[PDB]
Write a protein that binds this ligand. Structure first.
Ligand SMILES: CN(C)c1ccc(C(=C2C=CC(=[N+](C)C)C=C2)c2ccccc2)cc1
Ligand SMILES: CN(C)c1ccc(C(=C2C=CC(=[N+](C)C)C=C2)c2ccccc2)cc1
Lengths: 173, 173
């Protein structure tokens, strides 16, 4: 896009290969192939750069969730919907997908990054709480996290059938 | 103990403050306050050092599990037992506890560290599969991971009552 985006994109490509540690304005400038000046002009702190990156990723996810209105439809299959939302991104692309999670975590173990790293759970959690109940909402958010790990931690494909199955055991009747 | 242990201990203290990245034979030698020679004599590669550290942590956990024979007792409360096992370490010490998880993860996003980083799930998983069934075993392992995150990702204390509650919803009848 116009260089600010180019920079955020490169920041991402750098972390997705050298980890947050190998992320500097030099690394980014090189990767985005832009003056060092540009990167600092747009992002004073590396944290500002990180935060921007996560916000982009958060919005990336908050987008697929909005593409599943059924999630808040009381007549829809909730677990089926949640398993689809997962499968929709954990499915396929086991390349850039593995990279997106391998930074969601990296982000999490960072003091000022963690709050934005789990924002996805805020939207989902708020939605499931209104749909079901607080305890069920938290339990659901918990297995979602549990399942992504299981998956993105082995040559283990997704398996919606399994996900919906365990998700369903959590929804009360 | 004798210096090999001193070194593993220091390796841990270093990662628990500078992350795997700030971990070198220099860092370790300094921290353990031992000749650089010693650290390389005992651990040729940093990966050998990391792996040793994780094995120590794995054995640390595999120890509390063995201290709960009830886990495999068909007449015992499984979810209650699992929630106790968790609460037993996630409870209190929200200092060194937070550090143990903030390296379990760090480990996980590392190609040759990940296999040893999830060994805990191998023992637990094998135990729950024999106790219940494959699908239930995996689902249980999944929420355990989910719950530790929820917890070790906010000023959020543990709450066994909650854990046992969601764990119980996963056990079939
Ligand atoms: C464990 N868990 C439920 C989740 C784990 C990670 C994600 C994320 C994400 C970002 C972009 C995506 N895209 C572009 C499809 C999809 C997911 C994500 C959100 C913030 C920072 C990094 C990654 C969402 C849910
Ligand atoms: C998400 N999950 C179920 C778990 C997450 C982490 C642990 C671990 C651990 C190490 C030492 C412990 N001690 C000394 C009590 C307790 C746990 C652990 C195992 C290997 C490497 C790092 C940490 C176990 C379960």
């Amino acid at each position: 896009p116009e260089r600010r985006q180019r920079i955020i994109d490169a920041a991402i490509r750098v972390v997705g290969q050298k980890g947050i540690a190998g992320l500097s304005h030099r690394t980014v400038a090189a990767e985005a192939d832009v003056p060092l000046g540009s990167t600092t002009y747009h992002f004073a702190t590396l944290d500002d750069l990180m935060v921007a990156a996560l916000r982009q990723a958060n919005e990336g996810f908050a987008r697929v969730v909005a593409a599943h209105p059924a999630l808040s439809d009381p007549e829809a299959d909730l677990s089926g919907e949640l398993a689809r939302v997962l499968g929709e991104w954990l499915g396929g692309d086991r390349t850039g997908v593995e990279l997106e999670y391998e930074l969601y975590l990296a982000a999490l173990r960072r003091p000022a990054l963690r709050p934005v790293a789990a924002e996805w759970a805020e939207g989902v959690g708020a939605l499931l709480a209104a749909r079901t109940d607080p305890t069920t909402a938290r339990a659901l958010v918990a297995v979602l996290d549990g399942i992504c790990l299981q998956v993105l931690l082995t040559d283990t494909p997704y398996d919606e059938e399994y996900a919906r199955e365990v998700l369903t055991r959590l929804i009360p009747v």
